[PDB]
Design a protein around this ligand. Structure first.
Ligand SMILES: CCCCCCCC/C=C\CCCCCCCC(=O)O[C@H](COC(=O)CCCCCCCCCCCCCCC)COP(=O)(O)OCCN
Ligand SMILES: CCCCCCCC/C=C\CCCCCCCC(=O)O[C@H](COC(=O)CCCCCCCCCCCCCCC)COP(=O)(O)OCCN
Ligand SMILES: CCCC[N@@+]1(CCCCCN2CCCC[C@H]2C(=O)Nc2c(C)cccc2C)CCCC[C@H]1C(=O)Nc1c(C)cccc1C
Ligand code: NA
Lengths: 124, 475, 73
C-alpha cells in the first residue's frame, strides 16, 4: 500500500522522472545483479555449510549460513561467526573470496552500471 | 607493382607484347599476388582503400586473361587461402571487402560473392556465398576467426562483418540454442547432486564410510555421480589442451573457462584421492570444488545476451580494475598491519600479524572496530595509525575503485558486446563440431541455389545464405 | 504507383483520357491509397520525406478532382 504512493509521483515532473528511473533500474540492472549475486551467495553458502561441522547459533543449516553470508553485503558481516570447523585456513579463504567477489567487485560494479544506465536513459 | 598501388604497371606486366608476367606465380613462401595484397593491408583507411581496389582490379584481370583459373582459391605453402589468410592474420577491411564482393561486369560476374536475387519494388533478396566460410570445409573463415590466438588484432571485430553475424545467429536460433540449454540443465543437475551429496556428508570417523542406512545409498549414488562429472570435466579439459595446442600465454590470458572447469575437476580428483586415503582434509578440497562449481554456472550466461554482456563486464573488471586495486590495497593493509602489530604489546590476542590483518580488513568490510585497543602503550599513535589507514583505504581507495569501474564501464560498452558475440561463436562452433555426421549435415546453413552461369557456360551452384533488405533510394 | 514514388505515373493514372483510376478505391483489407501510403512508411529520413511529399500531392489531386470528397476520413 505505502509503496504504491510512488504512483502519484506522476503528477510532479521531477519526482515522476525519478520514479521512472527507479523502475528502469529495477528492471535493467537489479535483475541481472540479483541473478549473479544469488548464484555466488548460494555457491559459497553451500561450501561453508559443507565445511562447517556440527553446528552445536548452529550455522550447520543452509538458511542460517545463507543469512550470515548475506550480512556481508549489507556491511554487517562477521568473519569469525562460527569457530566450529576443522580447517580455519579454508574457512578464511572462502570468506575472503566471497567478500572480494560480492562486496568489493559486484556491488561497486552495480553502482557503476547504474551510473551508466542513468547516463543513457536521461531522455527516455 | 600491385602492393605499391601501381595499376598501370600491373596492366602492362599482364598485357604487354614482349613478356607477360604470370598471375599464378608463387614466391618462396608460396604466396601469390593476392596473398601479398592481403599481407600488405594494415586496417588503416587509405591502405584498405587501395588494397581493396587493387584486389578488385587484379581479380577482374585474372578472370579476363584466364577465365578458367580460380585465382581466389590458390593456396600458399601453409595451405592458407587469401580469404583464409585475411581472416587469420586479422585484416578486417580486406575480409569485409571479400565477403561482400559484388561485381557488375557480366563477363566476370561469377567472381562476386553477394548476389541480388530479386528486386521487386524497394525490397531485395540477397545471397551471400558460404563456400569456405561454413564449418563444413577445412580452414573455414568462422573456425579460423574463432580459434584465433590473442595476438591477432581485430579478433572480435572481424566477426561483425556480413554475413558472419547473421550466419552465426542463424546457426544458433536454428539448432544450437536447444543444445546449449540442455547442457545448462544437465550442469545444473550435476551441481545440485554434488551440493546435496556434500551437504549430507557423514561427520563421524575417518573416510571412507560404511554405507549402512537407506539414505547412505542415495548419498553414495550422489558421490559417484559427482566423481563422474569431475572426471568428465577433467578429460574434456585435457582434450581441449590437446586439440587447440595453446601456448602458455594463451592458456593464461584467453582460456579462463576451460582453465576454471579444469581446475574444479582437479579439485574433485584430489578430493577422491584424499577420501580414499583416510584423511579429513578431503573435505577442504571438496569444498573448493563446490564453490568453483557454482561460480562456473556464469559460463552459461553467454547463452543469453544481457547476462552474457554482464558476465563479460564482470571479467573485464576482475582482470583490469580489481587486480591493481588489490595490489595497492595489499601494500597499504600489510604496511599498517605491521605497524599496528609493532605497537601492540603482549596481545583475542592481537599480537600476531594474522589477527591484526584480519581487523584492518574488517575495516574495509564495514565492520571495523576502533577499540580493540587496550594493549598498546601509546593511544595517540594507535589512533593516528588507524585514522590514516581508514582515510587511505576505506575513504580513498574504495571510492576510487568505484569511480574507476564507472569509467571502465563507460569505456567498454561495445567491446563487451563484441567479446560476448565471439564467446557465443566459440560455443556454436564447438557444439556443431561435437556431433555425428547425420545431424551435422542435417543442419547445414543456406540452400544449394543456382547462382548463374560460369564463363565455361554451365550452371553455378553455391551454398548461399539468404538475406532480405529494403532500400528507399536506388530504385 | 504511390508506394513506389512515381509522382508522374500517379498524376497520369489520375488524369489520363482512356480510363482514370478511382482515388478512393479500397483493397481486400480496405485500405485507400492514403492507408497504404501510411502503412509503407517506416520512420527513416528519405522514406518519411517521400511519403509525406506524395501524401500531400495526392491530397491536392483529390481536392482538384473531387472537391466535395473528404478523402482523409
Ligand atoms: C523486489 C522484491 C524483493 C523481495 C525479496 C524476497 C527474497 C526472500 C527469498 C527467500 C527467503 C524467504 C524465506 C527463506 C527462509 C524462511 C523460512 C525458514 O526460516 O525455514 C528455514 C528453511 O526453510 C527454507 O525453505 C529455507 C532454505 C534455505 C535456502 C534459502 C536461502 C534463503 C535465506 C534468506 C537469506 C538469503 C538472502 C538472499 C536474497 C538476496 C529453516 O529455518 P527456521 O525456520 O528458522 O528453523 C526451523 C528449522
Ligand atoms: C582466492 C581469491 C582471493 C583469496 C584471498 C585469500 C588469501 C589467503 C590469506 C590468508 C589465509 C592463510 C592463513 C589464514 C588462517 C591460518 C592461520 C595462520 O595463518 O596462522 C597465523 C600465522 O600467520 C600466517 O601464517 C599468515 C600471516 C600473513 C597473512 C595474514 C593475512 C590474512 C587476512 C588478510 C585478508 C586480506 C586479503 C585481501 C598465526 O596463527 P593464529 O591463526 O593466530 O593461531 C593458530 C594457532
Ligand atoms: C574471469 C574469467 C572470465 C573469462 N571467460 C570465462 C567465463 C567462465 C567462468 C568465469 N568465471 C565466472 C564468474 C566470474 C569470473 C570467473 C571466475 O570464476 N572468477 C573466480 C576465480 C578466478 C576464482 C575464484 C572465484 C571466482 C569467481 C569468459 C568467457 C569465455 C571463457 C573465458 C574467456 O576466455 N573469454 C575470452 C575469450 C574466450 C576470448 C577472448 C577474450 C576473452 C576474455
Ligand atoms: Na557496518
Amino acid at each position: 500500500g505505502w509503496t504504491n504512493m510512488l504512483y502519484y509521483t506522476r503528477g510532479f515532473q521531477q519526482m515522476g522522472i525519478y520514479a521512472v528511473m527507479i523502475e528502469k533500474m529495477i528492471l535493467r540492472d537489479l535483475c541481472r545483479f540479483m541473478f549473479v549475486y544469488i548464484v555466488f551467495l548460494f555457491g559459497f553458502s553451500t561450501a561453508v555449510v559443507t565445511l562447517i561441522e556440527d553446528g552445536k547459533s548452529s550455522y550447520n543449516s543452509l538458511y542460517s549460513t545463507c543469512l550470515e553470508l548475506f550480512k556481508f553485503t549489507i556491511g554487517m558481516g562477521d568473519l569469525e561467526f562460527t569457530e566450529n570447523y576443522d580447517f580455519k585456513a579454508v574457512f578464511i579463504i572462502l570468506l575472503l573470496a566471497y567478500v572480494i567477489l560480492t562486496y568489493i567487485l559486484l556491488l561497486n560494479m552495480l553502482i557503476a552500471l547504474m551510473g551508466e544506465t542513468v547516463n543513457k536513459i536521461a531522455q527516455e | 607493382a600491385a602492393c605499391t598501388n601501381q595499376l598501370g604497371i600491373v596492366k602492362f606486366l599482364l598485357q604487354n607484347s614482349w613478356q607477360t608476367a604470370d598471375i599464378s606465380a608463387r614466391d618462396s613462401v608460396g604466396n601469390t599476388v593476392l596473398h601479398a595484397l592481403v599481407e600488405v593491408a594494415d586496417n588503416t583507411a587509405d591502405n584498405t582503400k587501395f588494397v581493396t581496389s587493387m584486389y578488385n582490379e587484379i581479380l577482374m584481370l585474372g578472370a579476363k586473361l584466364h577465365p578458367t583459373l580460380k585465382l581466389e582459391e590458390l593456396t600458399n605453402k601453409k595451405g592458407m587461402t587469401p580469404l583464409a589468410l585475411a581472416a587469420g592474420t586479422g585484416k578486417i577491411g580486406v575480409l569485409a571487402y571479400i565477403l561482400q564482393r559484388e561485381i557488375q561486369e557480366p563477363e566476370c560476374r561469377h567472381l562476386s560473392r553477394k548476389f541480388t536475387e530479386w528486386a521487386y519494388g524497394p525490397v531485395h533478396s540477397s545471397l551471400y556465398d558460404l563456400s569456405c566460410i561454413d564449418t563444413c570445409e577445412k580452414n573455414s573463415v568462422l573456425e579460423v576467426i574463432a580459434y584465433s590466438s590473442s595476438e591477432t588484432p581485430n579478433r572480435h571485430d572481424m566477426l561483425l562483418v556480413e554475413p558472419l553475424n547473421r550466419l552465426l545467429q542463424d546457426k544458433w536460433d536454428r539448432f544450437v540454442k536447444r543444445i546449449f540449454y540442455f547442457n545448462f540443465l544437465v550442469y545444473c543437475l550435476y551441481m545440485i547432486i554434488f551440493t546435496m551429496a556434500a551437504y549430507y556428508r557423514p561427520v563421524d570417523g575417518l573416510p571412507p564410510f560404511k554405507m549402512e542406512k537407506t539414505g547412505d545409498y542415495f548419498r553414495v549414488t550422489g558421490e559417484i555421480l559427482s566423481v563422474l562429472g569431475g572426471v568428465y570435466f577433467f578429460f574434456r579439459g585435457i582434450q581441449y589442451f590437446l586439440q587447440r595446442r595453446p601456448s602458455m600465454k594463451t592458456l593464461f590470458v584467453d582460456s579462463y573457462s576451460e582453465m576454471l572447469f579444469f581446475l574444479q575437476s582437479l579439485f574433485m580428483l584430489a578430493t577422491v584421492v584424499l577420501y580414499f586415503s583416510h584423511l579429513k582434509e578431503y573435505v577442504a578440497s571438496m569444498v573448493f570444488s563446490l564453490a568453483l562449481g557454482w561460480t562456473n554456472m556464469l559460463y552459461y550466461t553467454r547463452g543469453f545476451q544481457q547476462m552474457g554482456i554482464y558476465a563479460v563486464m564482470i571479467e573485464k573488471m576482475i582482470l583490469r580494475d580489481l587486480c591493481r586495486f588489490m595490489f595497492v590495497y595489499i601494500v597499504f593493509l600489510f604496511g599498517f598491519s605491521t605497524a599496528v602489530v609493532t605497537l601492540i604489546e603482549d596481545g583475542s590476542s592481537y599480537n600476531s600479524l594474522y589477527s591484526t590483518c584480519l581487523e584492518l580488513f574488517k575495516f574495509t568490510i564495514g565492520m571495523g572496530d576502533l577499540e580493540f585497543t587496550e594493549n598498546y602503550d601509546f593511544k595517540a599513535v594507535f589512533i593516528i595509525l588507524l585514522l590514516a589507514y581508514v582515510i587511505l583505504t576505506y575513504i580513498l581507495l574504495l571510492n576510487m575503485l568505484i569511480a574507476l569501474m564507472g569509467e571502465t564501464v563507460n569505456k567498454i560498452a561495445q567491446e563487451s558486446k563484441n567479446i560476448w558475440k565471439l564467446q557465443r561463436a566459440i560455443t556454436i562452433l564447438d557444439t556443431e563440431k561435437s556431433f555425428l555426421k547425420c545431424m551435422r549435415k542435417a543442419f547445414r546453413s543456406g540452400k544449394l541455389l543456382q547462382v548463374g552461369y560460369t564463363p565455361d557456360g554451365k550452371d553455378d551452384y553455391r551454398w548461399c545464405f539468404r538475406v532480405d533488405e529494403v532500400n528507399w533510394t536506388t530504385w
